[PDB]
Amino acid sequence: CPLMVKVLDAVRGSPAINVAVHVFRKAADDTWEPFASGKTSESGELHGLTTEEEFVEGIYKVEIDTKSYWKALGISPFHEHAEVVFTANDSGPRRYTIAALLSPYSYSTTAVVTN
Amino acid sequence: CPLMVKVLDAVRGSPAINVAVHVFRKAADDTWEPFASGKTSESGELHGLTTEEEFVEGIYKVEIDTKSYWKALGISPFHEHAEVVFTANDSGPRRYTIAALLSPYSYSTTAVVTNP
Amino acid sequence: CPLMVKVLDAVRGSPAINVAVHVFRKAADDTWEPFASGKTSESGELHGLTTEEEFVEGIYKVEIDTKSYWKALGISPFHEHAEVVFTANDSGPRRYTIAALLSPYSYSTTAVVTNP
Amino acid sequence: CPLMVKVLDAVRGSPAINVAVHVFRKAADDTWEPFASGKTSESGELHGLTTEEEFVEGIYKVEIDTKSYWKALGISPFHEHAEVVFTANDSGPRRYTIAALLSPYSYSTTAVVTN
Ligand SMILES: Cc1ccc(Nc2c(F)cccc2Cl)c(CC(=O)O)c1
Ligand SMILES: Cc1ccc(Nc2c(F)cccc2Cl)c(CC(=O)O)c1
């Protein structure tokens, strides 16, 4: 599991469950090609997005549909989503955990890059 | 100004100065049209990106070039940028301050939205 | 002023107004002496807590009463407060802006430290 | 495991390993009584701090020695520590994860409160 997305709801202090997450790889022509997606689970985590073979170096965008999450909860959000764009380098072995800490008018996203 | 971007360096506890900021607006055909861009100043602020006439409703994307920032300070950061995509002025004109707090592997983007 | 506290409500995307802020300084005997306190204003800022004469080196604690804040808005928040403990003016006088970004279960405290 | 502290280093995008964490319970006289402590592990996590029986309602302070962590890395930090003070309520069953996302001049701390 080279890439795991973790989403936390900073309003309820809970994992942000059932949050749509799309991953995209930047194609040569600078457009985003859908690559992987899922919904975060009960634990706010989205595993099994990609695999080691698939997850090659490149520029990836993780788009977290924070807005539907806030809509589902009835809280007016500021952002359309949360959108983590980063270069997977893979110079040494890497797991990437992208943790998005979400508030209606603020989000934080952190990469915990290990191995 | 209706749109202000502020950027802090959470490593140096400083304003993040000379950070490139690009603002786009989603056009009718769902492309991003270049809307405005600028550098944060010596206070980490980027004022005057736009005006209350120009800053109509729409979805805007603010791409703060955090990578060049960290790179110029010798850091290889995780993200290519800090993004902020939001619907602006949906229930009439607002002032938006987008505050981006930057660390090499984490950033936070907050909006202070006030009713002028 | 050498010490400014700014507090944002990340739920409402607003300044967090009328937030009680208490500043303490660690005395010789390692107790916290009350140093200064105030409310954030209508801009979420608390200026004039102290002066450059009064704001000597030491360890200071800033306790931002985030709980009363969230409680007055009907929210049961997680933390009793947002704290900031820091050594101030160790290598001469600095201006400190403490920016506290508040959510009911998360807060972030950042310092913008500039050399006047 | 009613209370788990997770510390992330936002500069290196790694778990913050070997970070001293002290937990205190507010005593009746308003002083902090040491209750539990540990060092975060390799995964940035500090488990086994307390137990269900021990972790009664009360006001707790989690003090994270962020400053020694930054010193160990040679980066001048702003804060003396990170200090999470909160009321354990236990109205329904709760695990508390206190995640501290640490930068030299910024920290974020979030409670993920589940069950
Ligand atoms: C009411 C208010 C809220 C937030 C900010 N900016 C800000 C922020 F939103 C997060 C971290 C640091 C800073 Cl400086 C500011 C601008 C400032 O005075 O630094 C004002
Ligand atoms: C239940 C839970 C809550 C939060 C986190 N992690 C986390 C993190 F890894 C970075 C920044 C904030 C947070 Cl909250 C985690 C750990 C993770 O799976 O990365 C678990």
Short mmCIF file of C-alpha atoms and ligand atoms in Angstrom, two decimals:
data_model
loop_
_atom_site.label_atom_id
_atom_site.label_comp_id
_atom_site.label_asym_id
_atom_site.label_seq_id
_atom_site.Cartn_x
_atom_site.Cartn_y
_atom_site.Cartn_z
CA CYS A 1 0.00 0.00 0.00
CA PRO A 2 2.24 2.86 -1.37
CA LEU A 3 -0.35 5.60 -0.93
CA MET A 4 -2.95 5.98 1.78
CA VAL A 5 -5.26 8.94 2.32
CA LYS A 6 -6.46 9.74 5.83
CA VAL A 7 -9.17 12.34 6.38
CA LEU A 8 -10.07 13.81 9.76
CA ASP A 9 -13.01 16.02 10.62
CA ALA A 10 -11.71 18.77 12.90
CA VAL A 11 -15.25 19.88 13.79
CA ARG A 12 -16.46 16.58 15.21
CA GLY A 13 -12.98 15.18 16.00
CA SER A 14 -13.80 12.09 14.09
CA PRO A 15 -12.46 10.40 11.06
CA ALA A 16 -14.11 11.90 7.98
CA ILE A 17 -15.93 8.85 6.72
CA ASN A 18 -17.35 8.39 3.23
CA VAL A 19 -15.21 11.12 1.75
CA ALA A 20 -14.62 10.74 -1.97
CA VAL A 21 -10.97 10.87 -2.86
CA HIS A 22 -9.68 10.93 -6.42
CA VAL A 23 -6.13 10.46 -7.37
CA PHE A 24 -4.78 11.71 -10.66
CA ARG A 25 -1.49 11.40 -12.36
CA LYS A 26 -0.22 14.31 -14.40
CA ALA A 27 -0.14 13.13 -18.04
CA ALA A 28 2.69 14.37 -20.41
CA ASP A 29 0.27 17.00 -21.85
CA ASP A 30 -0.14 18.52 -18.33
CA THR A 31 -3.63 17.19 -17.84
CA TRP A 32 -4.71 15.11 -14.89
CA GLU A 33 -5.43 11.54 -15.71
CA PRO A 34 -7.70 9.77 -13.18
CA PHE A 35 -5.63 7.03 -11.65
CA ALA A 36 -7.44 5.85 -8.46
CA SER A 37 -10.29 6.84 -6.18
CA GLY A 38 -12.27 5.57 -3.24
CA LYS A 39 -14.30 6.71 -0.25
CA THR A 40 -12.56 6.97 3.08
CA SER A 41 -13.69 4.18 5.43
CA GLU A 42 -15.09 4.20 8.93
CA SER A 43 -11.58 4.98 10.16
CA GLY A 44 -11.31 7.98 7.79
CA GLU A 45 -8.73 6.02 5.78
CA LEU A 46 -8.66 5.11 2.13
CA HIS A 47 -6.28 2.19 1.52
CA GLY A 48 -5.67 0.12 -1.59
CA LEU A 49 -5.76 3.15 -3.82
CA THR A 50 -2.80 1.97 -5.83
CA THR A 51 -0.05 -0.57 -5.81
CA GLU A 52 3.69 -0.46 -5.81
CA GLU A 53 3.89 -1.41 -9.52
CA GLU A 54 1.40 1.29 -10.51
CA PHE A 55 2.58 4.04 -8.27
CA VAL A 56 5.52 5.21 -10.30
CA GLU A 57 7.29 8.54 -9.94
CA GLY A 58 5.25 11.35 -11.28
CA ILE A 59 3.13 14.23 -10.17
CA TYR A 60 0.01 13.20 -8.50
CA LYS A 61 -3.02 15.08 -7.42
CA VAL A 62 -5.20 13.79 -4.58
CA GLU A 63 -8.53 15.50 -4.67
CA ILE A 64 -10.63 15.10 -1.57
CA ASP A 65 -14.20 15.97 -1.98
CA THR A 66 -14.35 17.95 1.28
CA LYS A 67 -17.30 19.94 0.09
CA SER A 68 -19.74 16.97 -0.18
CA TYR A 69 -18.45 15.87 3.21
CA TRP A 70 -19.39 19.20 4.73
CA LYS A 71 -22.65 19.27 2.83
CA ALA A 72 -23.56 15.83 4.19
CA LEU A 73 -23.06 17.27 7.67
CA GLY A 74 -24.95 20.48 6.92
CA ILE A 75 -22.03 22.81 7.43
CA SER A 76 -21.23 25.46 4.84
CA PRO A 77 -17.65 24.78 3.68
CA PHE A 78 -15.30 27.19 2.05
CA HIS A 79 -13.41 24.93 -0.31
CA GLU A 80 -14.62 23.07 -3.32
CA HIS A 81 -12.31 20.25 -2.28
CA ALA A 82 -8.83 19.72 -0.84
CA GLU A 83 -6.28 19.10 -3.53
CA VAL A 84 -2.88 17.66 -2.68
CA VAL A 85 -0.44 17.83 -5.58
CA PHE A 86 2.90 16.27 -5.05
CA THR A 87 5.76 14.46 -6.75
CA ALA A 88 6.13 10.78 -5.90
CA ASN A 89 9.90 10.40 -6.00
CA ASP A 90 10.49 6.80 -4.93
CA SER A 91 14.23 7.38 -4.60
CA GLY A 92 14.19 5.03 -1.63
CA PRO A 93 11.11 2.96 -0.81
CA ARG A 94 8.14 5.15 0.15
CA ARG A 95 4.74 4.77 1.67
CA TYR A 96 2.83 8.04 1.41
CA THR A 97 0.14 8.90 3.93
CA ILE A 98 -1.67 11.99 2.97
CA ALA A 99 -3.59 13.12 5.99
CA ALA A 100 -6.17 15.84 5.38
CA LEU A 101 -7.40 17.59 8.51
CA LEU A 102 -10.58 19.27 7.49
CA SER A 103 -12.51 22.20 8.87
CA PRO A 104 -15.20 24.02 7.00
CA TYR A 105 -13.00 27.01 6.35
CA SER A 106 -9.64 25.45 6.77
CA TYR A 107 -7.83 22.40 5.74
CA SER A 108 -4.51 21.02 6.46
CA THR A 109 -2.77 18.32 4.53
CA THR A 110 0.33 16.58 5.53
CA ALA A 111 2.32 13.88 3.94
CA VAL A 112 3.79 11.23 6.19
CA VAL A 113 6.31 9.64 3.95
CA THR A 114 8.00 6.53 5.35
CA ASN A 115 10.32 3.49 4.59
CA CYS B 1 -9.31 44.24 -1.74
CA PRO B 2 -11.80 41.41 -2.06
CA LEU B 3 -9.09 38.77 -2.28
CA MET B 4 -5.95 38.69 -0.27
CA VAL B 5 -3.51 35.82 -0.02
CA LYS B 6 -1.28 35.53 2.98
CA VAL B 7 1.46 32.96 3.24
CA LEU B 8 3.46 32.01 6.31
CA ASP B 9 6.53 29.89 6.59
CA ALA B 10 5.85 27.60 9.62
CA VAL B 11 9.55 26.46 9.62
CA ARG B 12 11.01 29.93 9.88
CA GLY B 13 8.01 31.50 11.73
CA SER B 14 8.09 34.22 9.15
CA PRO B 15 5.99 35.60 6.38
CA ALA B 16 6.72 33.58 3.25
CA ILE B 17 7.98 36.33 1.02
CA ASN B 18 8.10 36.41 -2.77
CA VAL B 19 5.78 33.39 -3.04
CA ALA B 20 4.20 33.22 -6.48
CA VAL B 21 0.42 33.08 -6.32
CA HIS B 22 -1.79 32.33 -9.31
CA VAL B 23 -5.45 32.80 -9.30
CA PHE B 24 -7.72 31.11 -11.81
CA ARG B 25 -11.36 31.20 -12.36
CA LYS B 26 -13.33 28.32 -13.76
CA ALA B 27 -14.75 29.41 -17.13
CA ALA B 28 -18.11 28.35 -18.60
CA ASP B 29 -16.44 25.39 -20.36
CA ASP B 30 -15.00 24.19 -17.05
CA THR B 31 -11.39 25.23 -17.89
CA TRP B 32 -9.38 27.42 -15.52
CA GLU B 33 -9.00 30.87 -16.94
CA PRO B 34 -5.96 32.77 -15.53
CA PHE B 35 -7.51 35.34 -13.24
CA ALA B 36 -4.65 37.19 -11.53
CA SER B 37 -1.32 36.41 -10.02
CA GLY B 38 1.28 38.06 -7.91
CA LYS B 39 4.01 37.62 -5.28
CA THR B 40 3.53 37.81 -1.56
CA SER B 41 5.32 40.82 -0.21
CA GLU B 42 7.75 41.28 2.62
CA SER B 43 4.81 40.73 5.03
CA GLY B 44 3.85 37.44 3.29
CA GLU B 45 0.82 39.18 1.89
CA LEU B 46 -0.43 39.52 -1.62
CA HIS B 47 -2.88 42.33 -1.94
CA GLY B 48 -4.48 43.84 -4.98
CA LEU B 49 -4.89 40.62 -6.93
CA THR B 50 -8.28 41.81 -8.02
CA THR B 51 -11.06 44.26 -7.60
CA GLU B 52 -14.67 44.08 -6.45
CA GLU B 53 -15.79 44.66 -10.09
CA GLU B 54 -13.54 41.93 -11.46
CA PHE B 55 -14.02 39.43 -8.63
CA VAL B 56 -17.36 38.12 -9.72
CA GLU B 57 -19.01 34.93 -8.53
CA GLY B 58 -17.40 31.79 -9.73
CA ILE B 59 -15.11 29.04 -8.64
CA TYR B 60 -11.64 30.26 -8.18
CA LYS B 61 -8.46 28.36 -7.72
CA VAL B 62 -5.53 29.95 -5.92
CA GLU B 63 -2.23 28.03 -6.66
CA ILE B 64 0.43 29.20 -4.28
CA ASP B 65 3.84 28.13 -5.59
CA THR B 66 5.02 26.60 -2.33
CA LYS B 67 7.51 24.29 -4.05
CA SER B 68 9.67 27.17 -5.53
CA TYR B 69 9.48 28.79 -2.13
CA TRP B 70 10.86 25.78 -0.24
CA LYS B 71 13.26 25.04 -3.05
CA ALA B 72 14.75 28.55 -2.96
CA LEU B 73 15.35 27.90 0.78
CA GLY B 74 17.08 24.57 0.01
CA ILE B 75 14.16 22.36 1.02
CA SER B 76 12.65 19.65 -1.09
CA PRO B 77 9.05 19.94 -0.11
CA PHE B 78 6.28 17.43 -0.57
CA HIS B 79 3.67 19.41 -2.44
CA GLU B 80 4.01 21.07 -5.80
CA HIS B 81 1.83 23.85 -4.49
CA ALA B 82 -0.80 24.83 -1.99
CA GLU B 83 -4.18 25.03 -3.62
CA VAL B 84 -7.37 26.69 -2.67
CA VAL B 85 -10.46 26.05 -4.74
CA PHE B 86 -13.58 27.83 -3.60
CA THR B 87 -16.80 29.36 -4.74
CA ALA B 88 -16.53 33.04 -4.27
CA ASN B 89 -19.36 35.59 -3.79
CA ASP B 90 -22.15 33.00 -4.02
CA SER B 91 -24.31 35.01 -1.59
CA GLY B 92 -22.99 38.44 -2.70
CA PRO B 93 -19.48 40.03 -2.55
CA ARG B 94 -17.19 38.92 0.33
CA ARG B 95 -13.59 39.78 1.29
CA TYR B 96 -11.50 36.62 1.29
CA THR B 97 -8.25 36.28 2.99
CA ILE B 98 -6.64 33.06 2.10
CA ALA B 99 -3.98 32.26 4.66
CA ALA B 100 -1.63 29.48 3.69
CA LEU B 101 0.60 28.15 6.44
CA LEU B 102 3.53 26.27 4.93
CA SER B 103 5.77 23.46 6.11
CA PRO B 104 7.82 21.34 3.82
CA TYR B 105 5.43 18.39 4.22
CA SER B 106 2.27 19.98 5.44
CA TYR B 107 0.29 22.99 4.65
CA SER B 108 -2.85 24.43 5.88
CA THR B 109 -5.14 26.75 3.83
CA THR B 110 -7.71 28.84 5.74
CA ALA B 111 -10.09 31.40 4.51
CA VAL B 112 -11.12 34.42 6.50
CA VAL B 113 -14.29 35.54 4.77
CA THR B 114 -15.78 38.79 5.89
CA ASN B 115 -18.76 40.76 4.71
CA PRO B 116 -17.50 44.16 3.65
CA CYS C 1 3.37 45.86 19.76
CA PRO C 2 5.86 43.12 20.50
CA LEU C 3 3.15 40.53 21.12
CA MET C 4 0.01 40.16 19.14
CA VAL C 5 -2.43 37.28 19.33
CA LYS C 6 -4.66 36.54 16.40
CA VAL C 7 -7.40 33.96 16.53
CA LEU C 8 -9.40 32.56 13.64
CA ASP C 9 -12.47 30.42 13.68
CA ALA C 10 -11.79 27.70 11.03
CA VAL C 11 -15.48 26.57 11.20
CA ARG C 12 -16.95 29.97 10.42
CA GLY C 13 -13.95 31.24 8.36
CA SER C 14 -14.02 34.32 10.50
CA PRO C 15 -11.93 36.10 13.03
CA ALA C 16 -12.66 34.58 16.43
CA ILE C 17 -13.92 37.63 18.22
CA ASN C 18 -14.04 38.28 21.96
CA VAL C 19 -11.72 35.33 22.68
CA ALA C 20 -10.14 35.68 26.10
CA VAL C 21 -6.36 35.51 25.96
CA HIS C 22 -4.15 35.23 29.03
CA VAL C 23 -0.49 35.69 28.95
CA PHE C 24 1.78 34.40 31.69
CA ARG C 25 5.42 34.56 32.22
CA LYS C 26 7.39 31.94 34.03
CA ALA C 27 8.82 33.51 37.20
CA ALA C 28 12.17 32.69 38.81
CA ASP C 29 10.51 30.03 41.00
CA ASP C 30 9.06 28.35 37.90
CA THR C 31 5.46 29.50 38.59
CA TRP C 32 3.44 31.30 35.91
CA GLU C 33 3.06 34.93 36.80
CA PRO C 34 0.02 36.60 35.12
CA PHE C 35 1.57 38.79 32.47
CA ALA C 36 -1.29 40.36 30.50
CA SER C 37 -4.62 39.37 29.13
CA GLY C 38 -7.21 40.69 26.78
CA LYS C 39 -9.95 39.85 24.25
CA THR C 40 -9.47 39.48 20.55
CA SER C 41 -11.25 42.25 18.76
CA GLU C 42 -13.69 42.28 15.89
CA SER C 43 -10.75 41.37 13.59
CA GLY C 44 -9.79 38.39 15.80
CA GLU C 45 -6.76 40.31 16.93
CA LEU C 46 -5.51 41.18 20.35
CA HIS C 47 -3.06 44.00 20.24
CA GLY C 48 -1.46 45.96 23.03
CA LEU C 49 -1.05 43.06 25.44
CA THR C 50 2.34 44.41 26.33
CA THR C 51 5.12 46.77 25.55
CA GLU C 52 8.73 46.42 24.44
CA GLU C 53 9.85 47.54 27.95
CA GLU C 54 7.60 45.05 29.72
CA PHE C 55 8.09 42.14 27.29
CA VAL C 56 11.42 41.02 28.57
CA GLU C 57 13.07 37.68 27.88
CA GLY C 58 11.47 34.75 29.53
CA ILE C 59 9.18 31.88 28.86
CA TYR C 60 5.70 33.01 28.22
CA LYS C 61 2.53 31.06 28.06
CA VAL C 62 -0.41 32.37 26.04
CA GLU C 63 -3.71 30.58 27.05
CA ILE C 64 -6.37 31.37 24.53
CA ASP C 65 -9.77 30.52 25.98
CA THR C 66 -10.96 28.51 22.99
CA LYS C 67 -13.45 26.49 25.04
CA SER C 68 -15.61 29.55 26.08
CA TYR C 69 -15.42 30.65 22.47
CA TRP C 70 -16.80 27.39 21.05
CA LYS C 71 -19.19 27.07 23.94
CA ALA C 72 -20.69 30.53 23.32
CA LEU C 73 -21.28 29.33 19.73
CA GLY C 74 -23.02 26.15 20.99
CA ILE C 75 -20.10 23.81 20.32
CA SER C 76 -18.58 21.45 22.81
CA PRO C 77 -14.99 21.60 21.80
CA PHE C 78 -12.22 19.18 22.63
CA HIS C 79 -9.60 21.42 24.18
CA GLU C 80 -9.95 23.57 27.25
CA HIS C 81 -7.77 26.12 25.54
CA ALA C 82 -5.14 26.71 22.93
CA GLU C 83 -1.76 27.16 24.50
CA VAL C 84 1.43 28.65 23.32
CA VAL C 85 4.52 28.33 25.46
CA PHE C 86 7.65 29.92 24.07
CA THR C 87 10.86 31.60 24.96
CA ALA C 88 10.59 35.17 23.94
CA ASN C 89 13.42 37.62 23.09
CA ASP C 90 16.21 35.10 23.71
CA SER C 91 18.37 36.72 20.99
CA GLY C 92 17.05 40.27 21.58
CA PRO C 93 13.54 41.83 21.19
CA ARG C 94 11.25 40.30 18.52
CA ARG C 95 7.65 41.00 17.43
CA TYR C 96 5.56 37.88 17.91
CA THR C 97 2.31 37.29 16.28
CA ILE C 98 0.70 34.23 17.64
CA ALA C 99 -1.95 33.06 15.23
CA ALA C 100 -4.31 30.46 16.61
CA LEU C 101 -6.54 28.73 14.09
CA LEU C 102 -9.47 27.10 15.87
CA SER C 103 -11.70 24.14 15.12
CA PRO C 104 -13.76 22.38 17.70
CA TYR C 105 -11.37 19.42 17.75
CA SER C 106 -8.21 20.80 16.31
CA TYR C 107 -6.23 23.89 16.64
CA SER C 108 -3.09 25.14 15.20
CA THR C 109 -0.80 27.73 16.88
CA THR C 110 1.77 29.51 14.68
CA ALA C 111 4.15 32.23 15.51
CA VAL C 112 5.18 34.91 13.09
CA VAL C 113 8.35 36.28 14.63
CA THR C 114 9.84 39.33 13.03
CA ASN C 115 12.82 41.46 13.90
CA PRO C 116 11.56 44.98 14.44
CA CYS D 1 -5.93 1.86 24.69
CA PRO D 2 -8.18 4.90 25.61
CA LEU D 3 -5.58 7.54 24.77
CA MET D 4 -2.99 7.51 22.03
CA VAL D 5 -0.67 10.36 21.05
CA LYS D 6 0.52 10.62 17.46
CA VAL D 7 3.23 13.11 16.53
CA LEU D 8 4.13 14.05 12.96
CA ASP D 9 7.08 16.11 11.78
CA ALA D 10 5.77 18.49 9.12
CA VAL D 11 9.32 19.44 8.07
CA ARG D 12 10.53 15.97 7.15
CA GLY D 13 7.04 14.47 6.58
CA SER D 14 7.86 11.70 8.94
CA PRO D 15 6.52 10.49 12.19
CA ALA D 16 8.17 12.43 15.01
CA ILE D 17 10.00 9.61 16.71
CA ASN D 18 11.42 9.67 20.23
CA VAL D 19 9.28 12.59 21.28
CA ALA D 20 8.69 12.78 25.02
CA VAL D 21 5.03 13.04 25.89
CA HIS D 22 3.74 13.64 29.39
CA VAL D 23 0.19 13.31 30.40
CA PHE D 24 -1.16 15.05 33.47
CA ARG D 25 -4.44 15.00 35.20
CA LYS D 26 -5.71 18.17 36.78
CA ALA D 27 -5.79 17.56 40.54
CA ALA D 28 -8.62 19.13 42.71
CA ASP D 29 -6.21 21.96 43.74
CA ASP D 30 -5.79 22.92 40.03
CA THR D 31 -2.31 21.54 39.74
CA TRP D 32 -1.23 19.04 37.13
CA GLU D 33 -0.51 15.64 38.48
CA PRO D 34 1.76 13.50 36.25
CA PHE D 35 -0.30 10.57 35.14
CA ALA D 36 1.51 8.92 32.18
CA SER D 37 4.35 9.56 29.77
CA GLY D 38 6.34 7.86 27.05
CA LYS D 39 8.36 8.54 23.93
CA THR D 40 6.63 8.29 20.59
CA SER D 41 7.75 5.19 18.69
CA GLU D 42 9.15 4.68 15.23
CA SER D 43 5.65 5.26 13.90
CA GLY D 44 5.37 8.58 15.78
CA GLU D 45 2.80 6.95 18.07
CA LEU D 46 2.73 6.60 21.82
CA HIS D 47 0.35 3.80 22.85
CA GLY D 48 -0.26 2.22 26.24
CA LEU D 49 -0.18 5.55 27.99
CA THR D 50 -3.13 4.68 30.15
CA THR D 51 -5.88 2.17 30.52
CA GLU D 52 -9.62 2.28 30.50
CA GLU D 53 -9.82 1.90 34.31
CA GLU D 54 -7.34 4.72 34.89
CA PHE D 55 -8.52 7.11 32.25
CA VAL D 56 -11.46 8.56 34.09
CA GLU D 57 -13.23 11.80 33.23
CA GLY D 58 -11.19 14.78 34.13
CA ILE D 59 -9.06 17.46 32.60
CA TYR D 60 -5.95 16.19 31.10
CA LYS D 61 -2.91 17.89 29.75
CA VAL D 62 -0.74 16.19 27.14
CA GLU D 63 2.59 17.89 26.97
CA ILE D 64 4.69 17.03 23.97
CA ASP D 65 8.27 17.95 24.25
CA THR D 66 8.42 19.42 20.72
CA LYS D 67 11.36 21.57 21.60
CA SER D 68 13.80 18.67 22.31
CA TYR D 69 12.52 17.07 19.13
CA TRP D 70 13.46 20.14 17.13
CA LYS D 71 16.72 20.49 18.99
CA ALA D 72 17.62 16.89 18.16
CA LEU D 73 17.12 17.79 14.51
CA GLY D 74 19.01 21.08 14.77
CA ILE D 75 16.09 23.30 13.92
CA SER D 76 15.29 26.32 16.08
CA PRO D 77 11.72 25.81 17.32
CA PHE D 78 9.37 28.44 18.58
CA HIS D 79 7.47 26.56 21.25
CA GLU D 80 8.68 25.17 24.50
CA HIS D 81 6.37 22.23 23.90
CA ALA D 82 2.90 21.48 22.55
CA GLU D 83 0.34 21.28 25.31
CA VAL D 84 -3.06 19.73 24.68
CA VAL D 85 -5.49 20.33 27.52
CA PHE D 86 -8.84 18.70 27.24
CA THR D 87 -11.69 17.17 29.19
CA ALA D 88 -12.07 13.41 28.90
CA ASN D 89 -15.83 13.05 29.05
CA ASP D 90 -16.42 9.33 28.54
CA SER D 91 -20.17 9.85 28.13
CA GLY D 92 -20.12 7.08 25.54
CA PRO D 93 -17.05 4.91 25.04
CA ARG D 94 -14.07 6.93 23.77
CA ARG D 95 -10.67 6.33 22.32
CA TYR D 96 -8.77 9.60 22.08
CA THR D 97 -6.08 10.07 19.47
CA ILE D 98 -4.26 13.27 19.95
CA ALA D 99 -2.34 13.94 16.79
CA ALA D 100 0.23 16.72 16.99
CA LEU D 101 1.47 17.98 13.63
CA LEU D 102 4.64 19.79 14.39
CA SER D 103 6.57 22.48 12.58
CA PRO D 104 9.27 24.56 14.15
CA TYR D 105 7.06 27.62 14.35
CA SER D 106 3.71 26.01 14.17
CA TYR D 107 1.89 23.15 15.65
CA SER D 108 -1.43 21.68 15.14
CA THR D 109 -3.17 19.30 17.46
CA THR D 110 -6.27 17.43 16.73
CA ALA D 111 -8.26 15.00 18.70
CA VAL D 112 -9.73 12.03 16.88
CA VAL D 113 -12.25 10.81 19.34
CA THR D 114 -13.93 7.52 18.42
CA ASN D 115 -16.26 4.62 19.62
C1 LIG E 1 -7.69 37.34 11.94
C2 LIG E 1 -6.49 36.73 11.24
C3 LIG E 1 -6.49 35.35 11.10
C4 LIG E 1 -5.42 34.73 10.49
C5 LIG E 1 -4.35 35.48 10.02
N1 LIG E 1 -3.38 34.81 9.43
C6 LIG E 1 -2.87 33.63 9.79
C7 LIG E 1 -3.55 32.41 9.68
F1 LIG E 1 -4.82 32.30 9.25
C8 LIG E 1 -2.93 31.24 10.05
C9 LIG E 1 -1.62 31.28 10.50
C10 LIG E 1 -0.94 32.48 10.60
C11 LIG E 1 -1.56 33.67 10.24
CL1 LIG E 1 -0.71 35.19 10.35
C12 LIG E 1 -4.31 36.89 10.15
C13 LIG E 1 -3.14 37.83 9.65
C14 LIG E 1 -2.06 38.18 10.74
O1 LIG E 1 -2.26 39.19 11.43
O2 LIG E 1 -1.04 37.46 10.81
C15 LIG E 1 -5.41 37.50 10.77
C1 LIG E 2 -7.31 7.82 14.00
C2 LIG E 2 -6.17 8.63 13.42
C3 LIG E 2 -6.27 10.00 13.40
C4 LIG E 2 -5.27 10.81 12.88
C5 LIG E 2 -4.14 10.24 12.34
N1 LIG E 2 -3.10 10.93 11.82
C6 LIG E 2 -2.78 12.19 11.51
C7 LIG E 2 -1.58 12.26 10.79
F1 LIG E 2 -0.91 11.11 10.46
C8 LIG E 2 -1.09 13.51 10.41
C9 LIG E 2 -1.75 14.69 10.75
C10 LIG E 2 -2.94 14.62 11.47
C11 LIG E 2 -3.45 13.38 11.88
CL1 LIG E 2 -4.92 13.37 12.78
C12 LIG E 2 -4.00 8.83 12.33
C13 LIG E 2 -2.72 8.14 11.76
C14 LIG E 2 -2.65 7.72 10.23
O1 LIG E 2 -3.31 6.72 9.86
O2 LIG E 2 -1.82 8.34 9.51
C15 LIG E 2 -5.03 8.04 12.89
#
